[PDB]
Structure 1
Amino acid sequence: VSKTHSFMTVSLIELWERFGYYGMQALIVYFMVQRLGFDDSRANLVWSACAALIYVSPAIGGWVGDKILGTKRTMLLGAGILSVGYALMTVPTENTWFMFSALGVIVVGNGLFKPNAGNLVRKIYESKIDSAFTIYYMAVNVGSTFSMLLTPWIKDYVNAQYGNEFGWHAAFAVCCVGILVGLGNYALMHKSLANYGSEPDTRPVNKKSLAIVLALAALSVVASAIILEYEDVARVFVYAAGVAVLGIIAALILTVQTVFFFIFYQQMSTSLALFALRNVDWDFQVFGTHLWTWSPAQFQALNPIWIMVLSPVLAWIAAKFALGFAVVAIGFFIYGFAGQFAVNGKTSSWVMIWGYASYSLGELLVSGLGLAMIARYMMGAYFVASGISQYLGGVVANFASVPQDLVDPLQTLPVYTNLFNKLGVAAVVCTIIALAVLPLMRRLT
């Protein structure tokens, strides 16, 4: 049909997938802390292990779509399995194993979806694949803006019109029908747009291998649910993946810096979220009237929004890594200076907006210089180092962990802004690593 048509279908299904995903991420730690009974140290480690899995997952799943089932087949199977994940997330049971299983299903499902929608964009564009990929990574952001704004509101509204359950499960259902909407989209655009793409989808599905894939898939959901459940299993697994990834020259410092950057990134799912829930005035004032009043989770929506606001402006050299780190640093110093001004126990609001403005500028600046640069100069090692630093990002967000019996926001405020200030300095050390290693880029060329 067309290249922009195919790319359209795949970027749309991407958009709705990410809607579901971030709609769930914006609520998951609050669920574990507020609805389930978890302390924020566990909530962090569990969610961070889950992210590590989710991010090491597409390594296996990308290979399945190229070399075993179709890339379109595997993408679809991934989207279905994902849908079942949120489905489990909406049955109103506070049985941690039920929920961890729902999460495992999301891990398996995501490993099967993400890499293959990504390949489709690339097969659809045969350097205009960058033309494609930026628009792609934008579509992601409008989707995740929509859900990270909506699902916290559904949670609140339903939690009010009804009692505690669903509320959350209402929100996870919203995720599930987002996924379903995406699937119906593709289905109404299937051979139509996509048509040509995938290496082994040009023939019928191999029922022995679909059987073995689904079997091993089920086994992976149980593997996940257990790794999430026992922190020690996760720790040992991440540690093993650690000594293993490090076991196996230019892309080195690049991927290392990627680890650092990902610790800074994992902070918004976790410590920034809890800080936002506990020491931020959810009342947004446009100096000086009132519209409107945040729902703490909705602060995370500030990330894709700002990436959407500053993306057209930036449209108008791993030194961009350096600048990235610097801007992430003053982002964290704005969160650190969240005490020294705009404070009444729990107060700030604009602290979150400027904080996130800065932080996500640093993201846009480093949101490109990863896959493109390494793939223009392995994928597994990158995915393991990335998942690993997601977990590490969890144990770092743990440095601001507030005991459950400590609720005087006047006392929780320092513990957060100590972490945030220390990250700000940690980010400047990375800025020095970035610029120092810069002539090592000139020796090779």
Structure 2
Amino acid sequence: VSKTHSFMTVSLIELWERFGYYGMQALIVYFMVQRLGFDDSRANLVWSACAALIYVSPAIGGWVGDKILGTKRTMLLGAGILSVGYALMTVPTENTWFMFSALGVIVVGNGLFKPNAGNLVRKIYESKIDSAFTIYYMAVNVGSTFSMLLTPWIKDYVNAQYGNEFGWHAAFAVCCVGILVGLGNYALMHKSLANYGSEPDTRPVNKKSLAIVLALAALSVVASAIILEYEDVARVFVYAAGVAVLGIFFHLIRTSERAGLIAALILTVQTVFFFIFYQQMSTSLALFALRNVDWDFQVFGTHLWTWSPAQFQALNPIWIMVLSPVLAWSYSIAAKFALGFAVVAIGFFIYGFAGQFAVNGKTSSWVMIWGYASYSLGELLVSGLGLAMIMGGFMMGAYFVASGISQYLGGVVANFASVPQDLVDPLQTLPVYTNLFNKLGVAAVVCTIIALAVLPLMRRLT
């Protein structure tokens, strides 16, 4: 019908997938701490290790879709696997080895879906791909906004009326049917994308490669599950991946009139610094909002609604949609890496500033409003950190793993604010959060000083 209509199909299946995922991520940390018996120091590492596997997962699935299998049907393979994942979350048990299987299925499902969905978005428009993606991302933000608001409300509602289990699991069931809605939506308008495939979707399926990847995918689920439960398995894995990145960089030092890549090393170091700050938003800030934030939302002394601690994470997509047009009007260069560090700093200082003026053991919820406004602003102007990163094949891969490991590294930083489960009084848990965030803000000021001091080197490469 039109290229917009093919863009309509992929944006609809993309909207409903990020719906299911972010509706699950907002509750996955609370689910381990509250519903399951996980202490927070373990729930931080288990999620962060999963967030590391999730981030590097599109590297394989992006290659499987266009070199081996089909970018459409590999994207659909990822979607079907993701259906299983959230369906695996909705069965009501207290089995640990049951939830880790779902998270590993989510990791394998994510790698096969996300890059391929965004890959053919680039193929649909052959250079207004920038106009399409900017509408493609606003569809992501508007979709994840609903789920992060909807799914924690279902969790609160069904638990109040139906007992103890169905609340958390209907929330996950909502994420599962979200995937099925987008799959059904794609099944009806698939005709436009059927004529717009990758290079091998034109050609029929290779069952040798199909059986190989399906066996490796099941192998990967089990390999990802083991990594999550046994924390030390992930440590050595993170260590092994960390030494590899340090090796690819030194091997690149012994090469070439090519001083400009020592700046790429500096851009990688600050990237490791950045993901530790953003990973903090899903770990400590969720626990901070869980224990020491007054969910009662009152504007100038009148009650509106009582928050759910997972719905605070919906303020990230909201603030992205509110600030992206404002930055566009600001039109009428890796130094902006330093500017993002400064924004992240005052965001950690907001939570610190929250401790002084508002004291009841619980700081107000308005902190989560002004806080997430800062982190999302910081995220807005810097994210896509290594997309513009510039014989470069192992260089891009080193950037990937360094960003994946820092996801896990952000989890061990959040453990600095891991409350012992023998500390229940919120008056006593307030210092452990404000102390972490305050020096985290100081550390972000140091990164600002670092990136600003290193600026004469960046201007010298140009």
> Structure 1 CA distance, aligned partners of 2:406 and 2:422?
30
> Structure 2 CA distance, aligned partners of 1:129 and 1:423?
37
CA shift, 1:14, in A, is 1.3
CA shift, 1:376, in A, is 13
> Structure 1 CA distance, aligned partners of 2:194 and 2:271?
32
TM-score between the two structures when normalised by the length of structure 2: 0.93
> Structure 1 CA distance, aligned partners of 2:206 and 2:127?
34
Go from structure 1 to structure 2 and tell me whether the alpha carbon gap of 1:157 and 1:27 turns closer, same or farther (over 3 Å shift): same
Q: Does 1:113 align with 2:130?
A: no
CA shift, 1:368, in A, is 4.0
> Structure 2 CA distance, aligned partners of 1:63 and 1:114?
12
**Does the 8 A contact of 1:72 with 1:197 survive in 2?**
yes
Structure 1 unpaired stretches of 5+? none
CA shift, 1:377, in A, is 14
Go from structure 1 to structure 2 and tell me whether the alpha carbon gap of 1:73 and 1:193 turns closer, same or farther (over 3 Å shift): closer
CA displacement 1:81-133 (0-9 Å, x = unmatched): 01101111111111000110011101110011111112111112224222222
More deviation in 190-199 or 157-166? 190-199
Go from structure 1 to structure 2 and tell me whether the alpha carbon gap of 1:433 and 1:377 turns closer, same or farther (over 3 Å shift): farther
**Does the 8 A contact of 2:297 with 2:365 survive in 1?**
yes
TM-score between the two structures when normalised by the length of structure 1: 0.97
**Does the 8 A contact of 1:20 with 1:179 survive in 2?**
yes
**Does the 8 A contact of 1:259 with 1:386 survive in 2?**
yes
CA shift, 1:343, in A, is 1.8
Go from structure 1 to structure 2 and tell me whether the alpha carbon gap of 1:199 and 1:193 turns closer, same or farther (over 3 Å shift): closer
More deviation in 344-353 or 130-139? 130-139
> Structure 1 CA distance, aligned partners of 2:458 and 2:351?
33
CA shift, 1:11, in A, is 1.9
CA shift, 1:221, in A, is 0.4
CA shift, 1:153, in A, is 0.4
CA shift, 1:373, in A, is 4.6
Go from structure 1 to structure 2 and tell me whether the alpha carbon gap of 1:75 and 1:289 turns closer, same or farther (over 3 Å shift): same
**Does the 8 A contact of 2:386 with 2:399 survive in 1?**
no
> Structure 1 CA distance, aligned partners of 2:452 and 2:138?
28
Q: Which residue is 2:253 aligned to?
A: none
**Does the 8 A contact of 2:66 with 2:199 survive in 1?**
yes
> Structure 2 CA distance, aligned partners of 1:158 and 1:85?
21
User: How many aligned residue pairs are there?
Assistant: 445
Q: Does 1:273 align with 2:290?
A: no
More deviation in 205-214 or 25-34? 205-214
CA shift, 1:222, in A, is 0.3
CA shift, 1:62, in A, is 1.0
Q: Which residue is 2:372 aligned to?
A: 356
**Does the 8 A contact of 2:271 with 2:385 survive in 1?**
no
Q: Which residue is 2:70 aligned to?
A: 70
Go from structure 1 to structure 2 and tell me whether the alpha carbon gap of 1:46 and 1:377 turns closer, same or farther (over 3 Å shift): closer
**Does the 8 A contact of 1:331 with 1:424 survive in 2?**
yes
More deviation in 366-375 or 398-407? 366-375
Which of 353, 357, 367 is the equivalent residue of 1:337? 353
**Does the 8 A contact of 1:18 with 1:143 survive in 2?**
yes
Go from structure 1 to structure 2 and tell me whether the alpha carbon gap of 1:12 and 1:53 turns closer, same or farther (over 3 Å shift): same
> Structure 1 CA distance, aligned partners of 2:380 and 2:341?
11
CA displacement 1:218-241 (0-9 Å, x = unmatched): 000000110001000011101111
What is the alpha-carbon root mean square deviation over aligned residues? 1.8
Q: Which residue is 2:325 aligned to?
A: 312
Structure 2 unpaired stretches of 5+? 248-260
> Structure 1 CA distance, aligned partners of 2:124 and 2:397?
24
Go from structure 1 to structure 2 and tell me whether the alpha carbon gap of 1:180 and 1:372 turns closer, same or farther (over 3 Å shift): farther
**Does the 8 A contact of 2:389 with 2:396 survive in 1?**
no
**Does the 8 A contact of 2:29 with 2:43 survive in 1?**
yes
